[PDB]
Amino acid sequence: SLPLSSLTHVLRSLTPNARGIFRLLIKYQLDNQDNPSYIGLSFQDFYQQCREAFLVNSDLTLRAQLTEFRDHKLIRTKKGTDGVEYLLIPVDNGTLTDFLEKEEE
């Protein structure tokens, strides 16, 4: 797993909204970490959530952003029973927690 400081270093060269996007995805993973049936959010679901937080306004920009995240190994996808891609972050949840506690006091 990637350490907190490498994670921060990747994120600091992105835009404010990209950081928001990543934090929103963290929050979903951490809030559901004790549920073995949570396998992540679909793109359409996450897109709508990002749109409601004024983090993104097009399919295109979100998709570009997730693709950049994947190349940095900050997202992974897993196909559901339905053939739909579900989004998770392949970083230890302790590290992700520490990240949120720094990104606000």
From Swiss-Prot:
Compartments where located: Nucleus
Entry superkingdom: Eukaryota
Stretches that traverse the bilayer: none
Quaternary context: Component of ORC, a complex composed of at least 6 subunits: ORC1, ORC2, ORC3, ORC4, ORC5 and ORC6. ORC is regulated in a cell-cycle dependent manner. It is sequentially assembled at the exit from anaphase of mitosis and disassembled as cells enter S phase. Interacts with DBF4. Interacts with MCM10. Interacts with LRWD1 throughout the cell cycle; this interaction, which occurs only with non-ubiquitinated form of LRWD1, prevents LRWD1 ubiquitination and hence stabilizes the protein. Interacts with POLQ.
Task performed by this protein: Component of the origin recognition complex (ORC) that binds origins of replication. DNA-binding is ATP-dependent. The specific DNA sequences that define origins of replication have not been identified yet. ORC is required to assemble the pre-replication complex necessary to initiate DNA replication. Binds histone H3 and H4 trimethylation marks H3K9me3, H3K20me3 and H4K27me3. Stabilizes LRWD1, by protecting it from ubiquitin-mediated proteasomal degradation. Also stabilizes ORC3.
UniProt family annotation: Belongs to the ORC2 family.
Protein name: Origin recognition complex subunit 2
Organism: Homo sapiens
Residues shown, of full length: 471 to 575 of 577
